[PDB]
Amino acid sequence: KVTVGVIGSGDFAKSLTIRLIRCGYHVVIGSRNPKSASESFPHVVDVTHHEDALTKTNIIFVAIHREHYTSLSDLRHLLVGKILIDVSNNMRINQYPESNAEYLASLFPDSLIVKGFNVVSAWALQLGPKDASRQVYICSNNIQARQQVIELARQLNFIPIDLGSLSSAREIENLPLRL
Ligand SMILES: NC(=O)C1=CN([C@@H]2O[C@H](COP(=O)(O)OP(=O)(O)OC[C@H]3O[C@@H](n4cnc5c(N)ncnc54)[C@H](OP(=O)(O)O)[C@@H]3O)[C@@H](O)[C@H]2O)C=CC1
């Protein structure tokens, strides 16, 4: 089984882990408190500290909020070359001078940041997307990473919508707030 990483242990991380297992992946979780977080996950999930989880995969969902990204800054060297999937949303349209994915890319300039899955609810990861809204919008400045995340979306039974460069991340982040 291919191993996919998730940083965080909240509702989104738990729901993502469900879907990843159901679709045939092995999951490693990086948590600040893995002994505590371990009960929030099945025994088949490897719950560990961030620095250990990162050695077990090259593709990591960053299932934390933007305001906590700098808590990972000391991992910069270990994260070099890894795909970081920015799943985040904000509470306001155009909240910051940069999109959350561009902010994450500025913190980890030698990682490969891909925006994706922010439009998917936790409940949708558990039950599946509605048949008329299976779409997940994906973008990145790195074409190869973008295509890997597009393929992961397909394996998770979503319809990936390729919006090209990371410049698209801002309006992808605005979309849940628009109607
Ligand atoms: N909930 C949802 O339905 C959706 C959420 N999202 C996005 O997913 C991401 C997570 O959302 P959600 O699960 O609801 O968020 P939570 O508020 O549950 O936070 C998630 C994780 O953040 C981690 N973390 C929390 N604080 C810190 C910190 N101070 N430093 C380092 N890590 C920290 C915790 O992991 P730990 O304690 O294990 O370290 C925690 O389990 C967000 O970006 C959100 O916008 C996207 C679509 C839907």
Domain boundaries, the chain: 3-177
Q: Can you give the resolution of this entry in Å?
A: 1.5
Q: What is the DSSP letter of 130?
A: -
Among positive and negative, which fits the CA dihedral 77, 33, 105, 138?
Answer: positive
Strand partners, 47: 29
Q: What is the DSSP string of 31-54?
A: -SSHHHHGGGS-TTSEEE-HHHHG
Give 86 Cα–ligand 1 centroid separation in angstroms.
12
Give 3 Cα–ligand 1 centroid separation in angstroms.
20
- In ligand 1, which atom is closest to the CA atom of 66? 43
- Whether 5 and 54 have beta carbons less than 8 Å apart is answered as yes
Among positive and negative, which fits the CA dihedral 145, 153, 122, 97?
Answer: positive
Among positive and negative, which fits the CA dihedral 94, 17, 68, 102?
Answer: negative
| Adjacency order of strands within the sheet including 112-115 | 46-48, 26-30, 3-7, 59-62, 83-86, 112-115, 135-140, 159-162
Token match 């995340």: residue?
149
Q: Is 65 exposed, middle or buried (0-12, 13-18, 19+ CB in 10 A)?
A: middle
Q: How far apart are CA 109 and CA 79, in angstroms?
A: 10
Q: What is the tally of helices (H) and strands (E) in the chain?
A: 7, 8
Tokens matching residue 152? 């992961």
Tokens matching residue 158? 């979503």
Residue 97: phi and psi, rounded to 5, are: -65, -15
Give 108 Cα–ligand 1 centroid separation in angstroms.
19
Q: Which residues are annotated as a binding site for NADP(+)?
A: 9-12, 31-32, 64-71, 89, 122
Other C-beta atoms lying within 10 Å of the C-beta of residue 123: 10
| Residue in 6, 46, 64 to alter for ligand 1 test, most ligand atoms within 8 A of Cβ | 64
- Whether 110 and 77 have beta carbons less than 8 Å apart is answered as no
Give 133 Cα–ligand 1 centroid separation in angstroms.
24
Tokens matching residue 52? 């250990």
Tokens matching residue 40? 């929030």
Give the closest residue to 6 by CA, choosing from 85, 44, 60.
60
Method of elucidation: X-ray
The CATH number for 3-177, chosen from 3.40.50.720, 1.10.3720.10, 3.40.50.1820, 3.40.50.150, is 3.40.50.720
Tokens matching residue 47? 């719950």
Q: How far apart are CA 2 and CA 19, in angstroms?
A: 14
SS3 144: helix
Give the closest residue to 169 by CA, choosing from 92, 104, 72, 83.
104
- Name all residues whose Cβ lies below 6 A of ligand 1: 8-13, 31-33, 37, 63-65, 68, 71, 87-89, 118, 120-122
